[PDB]
Amino acid sequence: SSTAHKQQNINHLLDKIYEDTKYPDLQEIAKNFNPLGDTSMYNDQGAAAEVLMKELNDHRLLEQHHWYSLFNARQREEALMLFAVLNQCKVWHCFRNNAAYFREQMNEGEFVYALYVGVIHSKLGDGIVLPPLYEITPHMFTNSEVIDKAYSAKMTQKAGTFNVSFTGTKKNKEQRVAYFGEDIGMNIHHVTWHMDFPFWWQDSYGNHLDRKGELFFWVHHQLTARFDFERLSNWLDPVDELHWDRIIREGFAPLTSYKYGGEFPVRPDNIHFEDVDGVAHVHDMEITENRIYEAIDHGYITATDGHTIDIRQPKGIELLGDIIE
Amino acid sequence: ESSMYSPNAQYYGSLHNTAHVMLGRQGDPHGKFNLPPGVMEHFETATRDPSFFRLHKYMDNIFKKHTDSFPPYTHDDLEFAGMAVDGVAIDGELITFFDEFQYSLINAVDSGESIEDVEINARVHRLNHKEFTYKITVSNSIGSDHLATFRIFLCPIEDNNGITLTLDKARWLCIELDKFFQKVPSGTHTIHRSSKDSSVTVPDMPSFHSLKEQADNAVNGGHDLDLSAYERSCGIPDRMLLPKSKPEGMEFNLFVAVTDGVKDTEGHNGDHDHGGTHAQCGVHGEAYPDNRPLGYPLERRIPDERVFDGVPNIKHVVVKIVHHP
Ligand SMILES: *[C@@H]1O[C@H](CO)[C@@H](O)[C@H](O)[C@H]1NC(C)=O
Numbered sequence A: 001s002s003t004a005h006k007q008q009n010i011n012h013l014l015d016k017i018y019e020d021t022k023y024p025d026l027q028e029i030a031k032n033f034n035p036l037g038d039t040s041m042y043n044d045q046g047a048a049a050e051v052l053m054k055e056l057n058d059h060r061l062l063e064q065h066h067w068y069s070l071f072n073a074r075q076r077e078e079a080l081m082l083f084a085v086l087n088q089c090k091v092w093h094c095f096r097n098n099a100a101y102f103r104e105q106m107n108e109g110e111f112v113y114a115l116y117v118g119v120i121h122s123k124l125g126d127g128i129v130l131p132p133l134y135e136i137t138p139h140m141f142t143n144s145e146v147i148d149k150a151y152s153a154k155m156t157q158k159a160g161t162f163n164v165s166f167t168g169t170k171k172n173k174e175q176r177v178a179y180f181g182e183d184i185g186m187n188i189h190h191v192t193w194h195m196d197f198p199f200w201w202q203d204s205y206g207n208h209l210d211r212k213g214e215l216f217f218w219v220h221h222q223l224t225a226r227f228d229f230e231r232l233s234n235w236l237d238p239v240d241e242l243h244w245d246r247i248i249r250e251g252f253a254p255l256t257s258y259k260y261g262g263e264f265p266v267r268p269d270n271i272h273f274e275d276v277d278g279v280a281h282v283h284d285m286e287i288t289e290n291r292i293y294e295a296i297d298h299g300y301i302t303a304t305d306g307h308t309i310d311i312r313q314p315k316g317i318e319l320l321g322d323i324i325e
Numbered sequence B: 001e002s003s004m005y006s007p008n009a010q011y012y013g014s015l016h017n018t019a020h021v022m023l024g025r026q027g028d029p030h031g032k033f034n035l036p037p038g039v040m041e042h043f044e045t046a047t048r049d050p051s052f053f054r055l056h057k058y059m060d061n062i063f064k065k066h067t068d069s070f071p072p073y074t075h076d077d078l079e080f081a082g083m084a085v086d087g088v089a090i091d092g093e094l095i096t097f098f099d100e101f102q103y104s105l106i107n108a109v110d111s112g113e114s115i116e117d118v119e120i121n122a123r124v125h126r127l128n129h130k131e132f133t134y135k136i137t138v139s140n141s142i143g144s145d146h147l148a149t150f151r152i153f154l155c156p157i158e159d160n161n162g163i164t165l166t167l168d169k170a171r172w173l174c175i176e177l178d179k180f181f182q183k184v185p186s187g188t189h190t191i192h193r194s195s196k197d198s199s200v201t202v203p204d205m206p207s208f209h210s211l212k213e214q215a216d217n218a219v220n221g222g223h224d225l226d227l228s229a230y231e232r233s234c235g236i237p238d239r240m241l242l243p244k245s246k247p248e249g250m251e252f253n254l255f256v257a258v259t260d261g262v263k264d265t266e267g268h269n270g271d272h273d274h275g276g277t278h279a280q281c282g283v284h285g286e287a288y289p290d291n292r293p294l295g296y297p298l299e300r301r302i303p304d305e306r307v308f309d310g311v312p313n314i315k316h317v318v319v320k321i322v323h324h325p
């Protein structure tokens, strides 16, 4: 319940995340703790814990050892159910005990996500430093070749340090700027910005995220402008913009893999967008784009009942970030 | 090409000449717009058009399939017995720059009946380079002096992606810088060859004004006119002997092959004057003086660089060319 103990608890919870916990205290908690045993530890008197326990007891949660994507609606909903519990804990023993309990029940990708945003958005997390995700889930930051050498080092029980090279070949001019988007710290900057300012945030979680929609515009504007500065530094032209009715010129082979789920897929050069089953038609993206530009060129956003919300004012850019993200 | 030497124009047609017209007319392919022929339809103008070089690489690759079909040269094919190239060096820096050149536009304008001419000139910026001297040290361990052909090429080391080229990947990219025949005395001697004497290049043409002045002065004074110091107009301009290179400098391979001049010039005399442009423009009124295939010894595949490295009469060295902006 002090910062040293909280930091150690988090360190332990995130250690060797693909395996059952090796810490005797956390194993005991995962075995014996009942998230519904004392609802006085929650600000919602157990409402969020009841929702998550029902999903768990009905065998409706994603299995362990499976890929996780925050953009997958149902998997995100499951991670946010655990976030919701952690976010309701009044004191650290509630936060730690629920984390230990659900670590052993829930998918590891969902758990890591929920624990990180739980620490970030709870006052109980104040003073904790989250370990870098590239050491908690290295597969998401390390190409498959190096992971295999790590797998080989483990299979052979020999220590080693292995050099990571950038993806692609020298024939690929885009490799000239791979040090930007592949930098592990740039990746942590990006994930952490979205953890700090999540698109799923609702103020019923406890507070408002000030100017979030405008900061969404700004942080990505700066990523784009910074990338273009690297291109300029490497005798490359600025990036083109995507358009739904034109080819995506530059393909990509990540040469990276999930821990569970297989290799990340590749995209060939010069492809037209295809409709994605279960997601959207390309035409839907064009219509959505058109509707956003209609608001911009009207000078107002149209509310659900048809009334106008003026955006010809300083908060207009923020409201646009709200509707665009 | 095709030329009137073609044994069967009815069947093989005229790929290259027809392609000049096909490309030249793509701005008005059906004659609907009354446009005149394109720049590709004149030898004066064809190289102005970027597509000239795409068309001529296409044609070059046709020839290359034939030249690639022969067996690679062997050590015994290439060795000039008892002739070693001990060293290749250049006296003077390899430096390029742009300077100014003027020519008259008077013939382009319309002259009035009994109104006086006025001087009207164009001033163009043209590539140029400083003079330099090859120093090729050769050891003749044959028991007598021997005629030798010195063949000098400039070859890329790396491509535009910074990838180091094999000899086989460089050879078709090499540019001819010189070819000359010279008696090599017994022993070790350094042959000196000025850049200005290249058999690949010819100087800038004398102006029309200068030719009029010289002819008029001779006719009006009853003097003989001796223009024999003037060279032919066929040949790479002296000023363009070297590629522009970069202000930061670029490194290239300077390739020197010394071959048996008695064999190469058999029937064409190694003492006779072969003019100043015989490498690509031949000898006016005479047979071509070098019996070897054009491009020798780089015109066949070199899959095994060890073969060339084991031939004492072949040597390449790294040189640097700097552009002065
Ligand atoms: C890995 O990189 C280090 C320094 O960056 C270097 O000392 C070592 O030679 C490299 N290892 C391999 C196998 O190339």
Ligand SMILES: [Cu+2]
Pocket: A190, A194, A220
């Ligand atoms: Cu983002």
Ligand SMILES: [Cu+2]
Pocket: B016, B020, B056
């Ligand atoms: Cu031609």
Ligand SMILES: [Mg+2]
Pocket: none
């Ligand atoms: Mg599945």
Ligand SMILES: [Mg+2]
Pocket: B196, B197, B198, B199, B200, B201, B202, B203, B231, B276, B277
């Ligand atoms: Mg000459």
Ligand SMILES: [Mg+2]
Pocket: B074, B075, B306, B307, B308, B309, B310, B311
């Ligand atoms: Mg050899």
Ligand SMILES: [O]
Pocket: B046
């Ligand atoms: O040509």
Ligand SMILES: [O]
Pocket: none
């Ligand atoms: O040509």
